[PDB]
Amino acid sequence: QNEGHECQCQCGSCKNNEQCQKSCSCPTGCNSDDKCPCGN
């Protein structure tokens, strides 16, 4: 909850909401735009 990694996500909810680019809860398999369990 208070730790993340690096959301270089270019998804549709990552490219718009950059408020999670420092705490996105996704594994190293978030390369698709329909498998992103991020903040949104």
* Binding site residue list for Cu cation: 7, 9, 11, 14, 20, 24, 26, 30, 36, 38
27: left (phi over 0), alpha (psi -120 to 50) or beta: beta
Q: Which is nearer to Cu ion, 24 or 28 (CB)?
A: 24
Place of tokens 């978030």: 30
For the bound state, the minimum distance from the C-beta of residue 13 to Cu ion, rounded and expressed in Å, comes to 6
27, two tokens: 């594994």
Question: Any contact of residue 23 with Cu ion (CB under 5 A)?
Answer: no
User: According to CB under 5 A, which one of 1, 22, 24, 28 is a site residue for Cu ion?
Assistant: 24
